[PDB]
Symmetry: C3
Subunit: 198 residues, 3 copies
């Protein structure tokens, strides 16, 4: 039930509630109200937001059974249990399918999708160990995934960024981040030495 990830919730550009830390390979992020943030569920219903408004409140009402994140066999899956769709932006996935990096994938109610593969990422990590601190640092972006409930964003939608959708989350993958750490530790980059003034 390792803590493979930690998840942060948002409502537009504002962060809402405390962070959730996975204590099992199966975590449910729903719009219900169990305050226990110590186990299986990450309930968004009880969360408050002084900056909230009708349209976000409306969207929150339809998160429902939300999404099912599942970690198994060095691969994470996302199942949309909510009656509404869910949209995900995973670079690792986008690479495995050959889509453009910023590509947003819709996961329809009841459906499922693999949003990450470790061996794949480890390989990409390897293929750049000796290519540049700049490009290896960029792999950080690979370890975070963003998905919003109900409202899409990107091409075909009016909303272009995830900061415009009323309900979304960001998932940090600890395994990948840690391995990436073991490698980044080898920096010593005096490159582009900047100013301490300007």
């Amino acid at each position: 039930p390792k803590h493979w990830c930690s998840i942060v919730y948002y409502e537009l550009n504002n962060r809402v509630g405390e962070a959730f830390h996975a204590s099992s390979t199966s975590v449910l992020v729903d719009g219900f109200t169990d305050p226990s943030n110590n186990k299986n569920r990450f309930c968004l219903g009880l969360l408050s937001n002084v900056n909230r408004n009708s349209t976000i409140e409306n969207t929150r009402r339809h998160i429902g059974k939300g999404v099912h994140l599942y970690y198994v066999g060095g691969e994470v899956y996302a199942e949309c249990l909510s009656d509404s769709s869910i949209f995900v932006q995973s670079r690792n996935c986008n690479y495995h399918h050959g889509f453009h990096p910023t590509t947003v994938c819709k996961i329809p109610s009841g459906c499922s999708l693999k949003i990450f593969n470790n061996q794949e990422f480890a390989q990409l990590l390897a293929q750049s160990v000796n290519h540049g601190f700049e490009t290896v640092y960029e792999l950080t972006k690979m370890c975070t995934i963003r998905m919003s409930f109900v409202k899409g964003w990107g091409a075909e939608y009016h909303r272009q960024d995830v900061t415009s959708t009323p309900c979304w989350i960001e998932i940090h993958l600890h395994g990948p981040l840690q391995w990436l750490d073991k490698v980044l530790t080898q920096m010593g980059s005096p490159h582009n030495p900047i100013s301490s003034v300007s």
Copy 2:
């Protein structure tokens, strides 16, 4: 298992970390004990890069603050500060018959019952086959807001709590948990929201 969690605010911004109750008696004061693992939720040590003189003024008057007591399925609010306190509690407001947004003033030394489980559970019951929309609204019954020194809303300016320099939000876990047990009833079929609009 924490009968509640509390959060602190200075105007519209959140300040400091969330406090999780480990006992039936909790003190939310303006002093400085860093420990956030037991009896007190100290606000004096918290910083705010957006802080201003007036908010700071208020902070100096928080003092012993408010005492939150949970017993026999009822929670009480006692003002230990030399200054008054103001509480907005739907449950409380529902029990006295006041308007839902009514903000009650609690003078220094006075006490006020701000939540009665019995009633809430009852409401939750009458809510059942009354729909998902109205049961979902019971979530608002589970959180309570109170400000230190300054009041807000009616009998002041009709202004939002976000207009007060020092205020907190209380989340009653007991009620929220029971509510969950019901909300999982499942529902909401209502013009299945667009994914573009």
Copy 3:
């Protein structure tokens, strides 16, 4: 032990969860270990939706960051980063005789003792009786701020630390706790026990 807690900011915004020291040796770097339960407080993995190029430029130069060392009742700061670091610590300023707001630059690979509670305990005692106002003031001594790469205050263009792209604030729990024992004994208010519980 829980000798301090640390918060990260990019300009005027708080970024990431609070870190709590579980040992006397803590590393605050710009790398990416997600474990926030031990030795390191990695800033690299932290997201900020309000982040801009210049901030990202500075984050890339944090590197091995600063090393906060608690030992013998004194805390030390060591710049392991290849770029300098800047520290504002009242206690330290007092000891050296500088002005309260003085910002001390800690060059790459250098070291500076930034806190001595023994002297702070002394300061606390001297104020034990000189006003609640002056004792309340010592709260400030308990917090320390330091940015990475960008100097600030006098000796620089930027004056406010909320003007630098990568700065943290450190709260010293021991000093804060001892200060609590006093502020409460001097308690500006009065109401001995509860009337409800």
